[PDB]
Amino acid sequence: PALYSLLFLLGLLGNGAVAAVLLSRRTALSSTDTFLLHLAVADTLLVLTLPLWAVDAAVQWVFGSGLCKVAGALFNINFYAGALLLACISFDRYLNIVHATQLYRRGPPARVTLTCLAVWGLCLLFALPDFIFLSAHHDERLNATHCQYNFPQVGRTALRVLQLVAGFLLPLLVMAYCYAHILAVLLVSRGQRRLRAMRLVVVVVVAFALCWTPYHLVVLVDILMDLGALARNCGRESRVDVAKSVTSGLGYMHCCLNPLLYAFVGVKFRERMWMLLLR
Numbered sequence: 001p002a003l004y005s006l007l008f009l010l011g012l013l014g015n016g017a018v019a020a021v022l023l024s025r026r027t028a029l030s031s032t033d034t035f036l037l038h039l040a041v042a043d044t045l046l047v048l049t050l051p052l053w054a055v056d057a058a059v060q061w062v063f064g065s066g067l068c069k070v071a072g073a074l075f076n077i078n079f080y081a082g083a084l085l086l087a088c089i090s091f092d093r094y095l096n097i098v099h100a101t102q103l104y105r106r107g108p109p110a111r112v113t114l115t116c117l118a119v120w121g122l123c124l125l126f127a128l129p130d131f132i133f134l135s136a137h138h139d140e141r142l143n144a145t146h147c148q149y150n151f152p153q154v155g156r157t158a159l160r161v162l163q164l165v166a167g168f169l170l171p172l173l174v175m176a177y178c179y180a181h182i183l184a185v186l187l188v189s190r191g192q193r194r195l196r197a198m199r200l201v202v203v204v205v206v207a208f209a210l211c212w213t214p215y216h217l218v219v220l221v222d223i224l225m226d227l228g229a230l231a232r233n234c235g236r237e238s239r240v241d242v243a244k245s246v247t248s249g250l251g252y253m254h255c256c257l258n259p260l261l262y263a264f265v266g267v268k269f270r271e272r273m274w275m276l277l278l279r
């Protein structure tokens with residue numbers, strides 16, 4: 001539990017600072033700056049639920065079904081928001097670094113509020129089912145009490161497939177295309193900043209892959225076990241549960257790392273932070 005709490009403190013501190021710095025600007029904010037601020041807000045909301053998940057996984061849900069509905073809606077909204085914002089940041093980087101000559105602007109701040117509102121609204125509509133269905137069941141298989149759905153198993157499979165194909169696959173493909181072309185362009189440029197650019201892009205892509213792929217791999221394993229492709233047994237189910245726990249831990253680790261890998265490495269944001277601390 002100590003590592004859980006330590007993860008909590010860093011996550012709150014890191015994202016809170018990023019949101020604080022970006023909200024201390026008296027003028028327009030670049031598109032990527034807006035996306036980063038929204039991502040920081042989403043990640044703060046998402047990490048607010050860490051103690052709940054830890055307690056639930058440790059002993060049992062004891063907060064009732066209403067707190068389930070609220071927390072599940074919170075988590076789904078923030079999760080989808082984080083995924084889609086990480087995809088939108090990469091798309092903005094692509095448009096600004098690959099088509100840079102075709103999108104030149106002589107210092108007007110291109111407003112991007114439309115995409116942010118669309119993302120948030122779509123996330124809310126995606127998370128809708130949590131407000132209605134998520135509750136607390138008394139299982140007979142584990143003799144425990146957790147927060148789960150009450151859909152038909154086919155409905156559970158449909159929801160899992162939707163999660164897989166709208167939270168991992170599409171963002172991942174967008175990121176891959178955008179960042180691969182960014183690398184391709186940067187390796188054919190001339191300057192002393194292309195080096196750190198490629199290194200940071202590669203680090204970001206590797207972090208995303210090796211922090212998200214495990215959980216969705218486990219989700220696909222569960223889908224397969226519910227689709228008849230794999231055989232259900234006590235040992236396999238226990239291993240799936242262990243994988244669930246560890247992969248969720250890794251996901252929270254990524255959520256805590258996000259501020260470092262996206263905000264604190266930029267000279268712009270570091271100058272902003274130092275100026276704000278001076279004030």
Ligand SMILES: CC1(C)[C@H]2CC=C(C[N+](C)(C)Cc3ccc(-c4ccccc4I)cc3)[C@@H]1C2
Nearest residue numbers: 049052053071072075147212215248251252255
């Ligand atoms: C949170 C709750 C209290 C309510 C919502 C779902 C719960 C369980 N569940 C589904 C395990 C949370 C969950 C989901 C996804 C991730 C994750 C995966 C990859 C990358 C980043 C992340 I973040 C981590 C945890 C508990 C009931």
